Amino acid sequence: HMPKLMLALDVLDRDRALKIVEDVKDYVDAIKVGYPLVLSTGTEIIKEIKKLCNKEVIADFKVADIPATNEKIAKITLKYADGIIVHGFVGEDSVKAVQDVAKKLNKKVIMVTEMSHPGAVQFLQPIADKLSEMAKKLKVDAIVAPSTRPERLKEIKEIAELPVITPGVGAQGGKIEDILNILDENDYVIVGRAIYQSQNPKEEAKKYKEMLNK
């Protein structure tokens, strides 16, 4: 009944990736696999990860193209993954193209709203409330909203009325204690580098999991 922990597995080597998954599996609740890993290893890594930890695996592919292309990417991705992350800024039709594929396969679609890095302020932040409204309109499964700006995370979550997965804790300077009050059992805190760059990923994953006790 606490917020959950999602590992952002952005390593570049299959062996290192599988090793980290094995090490952290008792403490992580889902694995987020992105293009840094997938372009290095191929989509086959997704099924391998899943068989190793028996947890949900989300493909963070930041899908951001026209509907026809989004549909192709979604079909390939969701053969292997349990869900897929899509950008909202490219427009409603592009999001729906991914949703249509995910609905037929019973898979999750997660939409990016405001992002966590400084550049997000330039274009994403001024329309992030409207992205949040769109996520609510489209009934996506969850949204991505930023740990680095707790006030915005709260605001975005309350507009969307959807579960969040939230990145920014650790390497990007976000701190668990500053967002813990905002999150519930249906949310995930995303942690990448703070876990995968450590000499003892098991211990760090355990530390982060226990930090989510609220």
Ligand X SMILES: O=c1cc(O)n([C@@H]2O[C@H](COP(=O)(O)O)[C@@H](O)[C@H]2O)c(=O)[nH]1
- Binding residues, by number, are 10, 32, 60-69, 116, 167-177, 192-193
Give dist(CA 180, CA 81) in Å, integer.
Answer: 28
Q: In the block, which residue shows the tokens 């409330």?
A: 129
What tokens appear for 18 in the block? 């599988």
35 binds a copy of itself (CB under 8 A): yes
CA-based nearest residue to 111, from 164, 73, 188, 155: 164
CA-based nearest residue to 81, from 30, 25, 15: 30
Question: For residues 128 and 209, which CB has a smaller minimum distance to a copy of itself in the complex?
Answer: 128
Backbone angles phi, psi at 60, to 5 degrees: -90, 85
Question: For residues 15 and 118, which CB has a smaller minimum distance to a copy of itself in the complex?
Answer: 118
Question: Minimum CB separation from a copy of itself for residue 139, in Å?
Answer: 17
Backbone angles phi, psi at 42, to 5 degrees: 95, 165
**Which of a copy of itself, ligand X, none lies near 183, with the C-beta cut-off 5 to 8 A by kind?**
none
Q: Taking a C-beta distance cutoff of 8 angstroms, is the pair 141, 108 a contact? A: yes
Q: Residue 40: how many CB atoms within 10 A of its CB?
A: 14
The yes-or-no answer on residue 62 being catalytic is yes
| Contacts (CB under 8 A) with a copy of itself, residues 58-87 | 61-62, 64-69, 72-73, 76-77, 87
| Total residues belonging to the chain | 214
Backbone angles phi, psi at 78, to 5 degrees: -85, 0
Question: Minimum CB separation from ligand X for residue 179, in Å?
Answer: 13
| Contacts (CB under 8 A) with a copy of itself, residues 37-56 | 38-40, 42-43
**Which of a copy of itself, ligand X, none lies near 19, with the C-beta cut-off 5 to 8 A by kind?**
none
Question: For residues 53 and 128, which CB has a smaller minimum distance to ligand X in the complex?
Answer: 128
Report which residue type is found at 29.
D
**Which of a copy of itself, ligand X, none lies near 144, with the C-beta cut-off 5 to 8 A by kind?**
ligand X
Closest chain position to ligand X (CB): 192
Angle, helix 44-53 to helix 14-24, in steps of 10 degrees: 20
**Which of ligand X, a copy of itself, none lies near 170, with the C-beta cut-off 5 to 8 A by kind?**
ligand X
Q: What amino acid positions are annotated as catalytic residues? A: 62
**Contacts to a copy of itself by CB under 8 A:** 10, 12, 34-36, 38-40, 42-43, 61-62, 64-69, 72-73, 76-77, 87-95, 115-124, 127, 130-131, 171-172, 193
